[PDB]
């Protein structure tokens, strides 16, 4: 069966790059800001279960809100993405969760699957630490946290695969 | 293969209304102006030939030129459309013909099939007469001319069928 997962987060944190790394194993330095939404399909096998994952990429910039929000509904799992070199993108997580909850209209937010991604760990000068990110995850839903690099491919595959697990875990919750 | 026929003409002449009337048999008083292009599939028999067709609908408004013109390539017939209650839409037929030829990048553009549609003939107070439209068609390539009403469903299929005959001729 099909699993819709959606990437939300500030402009330029690497949402598109994360998706193109996972689906096409490519990386681009000169990547254009996303205008609205995009999706790609990927077939995978997680824990015996053969699955198609439809990955929804959204524009992070404020002016594209009305473009992306009508595609929140129907997501099985939300990937909140920030950049470790950008403190602002990490401070905004609460806002992105609140926006997803409103527009996808998730009742039972206490159990809906979120997975947090700190991207661009390949950049030396960090602006958000591992522990403070791990702190926020424990306190705002106890979500899985992944430090990723779309540039290096670090933990990218693992992050997406985990989202399917969270969906399988709650789909088996009937 | 798939016959591509495309609708050009001034904003509000009834291009989307003709296509919707022909394909889905609906008509609406307050249609939104087209943003860019649209296409609907349509399959039919013409003179006993089974034909697969793709009707392309384009925006009339000038600011959307850059959205429509990439899609001219590979068109088999062009339907130039005006409203008979709008003499400006009729005067612009030459400008639409030239815009098609410039962007369509067709081999032998002088023998390309155009069909001319004068729409909205349900409106009694006409600004363009049948005779002047026929004079223009005869004098600017000798194209087939159809008076249509999307609203009253007048002569709507006949225009698209003739376009198919012109492609089949080519």
């Amino acid at each position: 069966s099909l699993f819709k997962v959606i990437l939300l987060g500030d402009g330029g944190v690497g949402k598109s790059s994360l998706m193109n790394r996972y689906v096409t194993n490519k990386f681009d330095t000169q990547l254009f800001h996303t205008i609205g939404v995009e999706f790609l399909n990927k077939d995978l096998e997680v824990d015996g279960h053969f699955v198609t994952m439809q990955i929804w990429d959204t524009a992070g910039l404020e002016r594209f809100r009305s473009l992306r929000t009508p595609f929140y509904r129907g997501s099985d799992c939300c990937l909140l993405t920030f950049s470790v070199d950008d403190s602002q993108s990490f401070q905004n997580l609460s806002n992105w969760k609140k926006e997803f909850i409103y527009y996808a209209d998730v009742k039972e937010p206490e159990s809906f699957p979120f997975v947090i991604l700190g991207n661009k760990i390949d950049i030396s000068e960090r602006q958000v630490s591992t522990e403070e990110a791990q702190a926020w995850c424990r306190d705002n839903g106890d979500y899985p946290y992944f430090e990723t690099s779309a540039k290096d491919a670090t933990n990218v595959a693992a992050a997406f695969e985990e989202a399917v697990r969270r969906v399988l875990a709650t789909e088996d919750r009937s | 293969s798939l016959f591509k026929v495309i609708l050009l003409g001034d904003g509000g002449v009834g291009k989307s209304s003709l296509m919707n009337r022909y394909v889905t048999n609906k008509f609406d008083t307050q249609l939104f102006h087209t943003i860019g292009v649209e296409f609907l599939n349509k399959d039919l028999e013409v003179d006993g030939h089974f034909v697969t067709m793709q009707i392309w609908d384009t925006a009339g408004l000038e600011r959307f030129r850059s959205l429509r013109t990439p899609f001219y390539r590979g068109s088999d017939c062009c339907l130039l459309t005006f409203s008979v209650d709008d003499s400006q839409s009729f005067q612009n037929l030459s400008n639409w013909k030239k815009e098609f030829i410039y962007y369509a990048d067709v081999k032998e553009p002088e023998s390309f099939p155009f069909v001319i549609l004068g729409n909205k003939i349900d409106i009694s107070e006409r600004q363009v007469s049948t005779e002047e439209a026929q004079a223009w068609c005869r004098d600017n390539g000798d194209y087939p001319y159809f008076e249509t009403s999307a609203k009253d469903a007048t002569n709507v299929a006949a225009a698209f069928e003739e376009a198919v005959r012109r492609v089949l001729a080519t």
Partner: peptide, 25 residues
């Protein structure tokens, strides 16, 4: 996928149009 492809092509052209409106503004 020529219908899907064609629709993708239209979507892309609409995104070009927005990209150029926004960069002026």
């Amino acid at each position: 996928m020529d219908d899907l492809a064609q629709t993708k092509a239209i979507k892309d052209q609409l995104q070009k149009y927005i990209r150029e409106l926004e960069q002026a503004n």
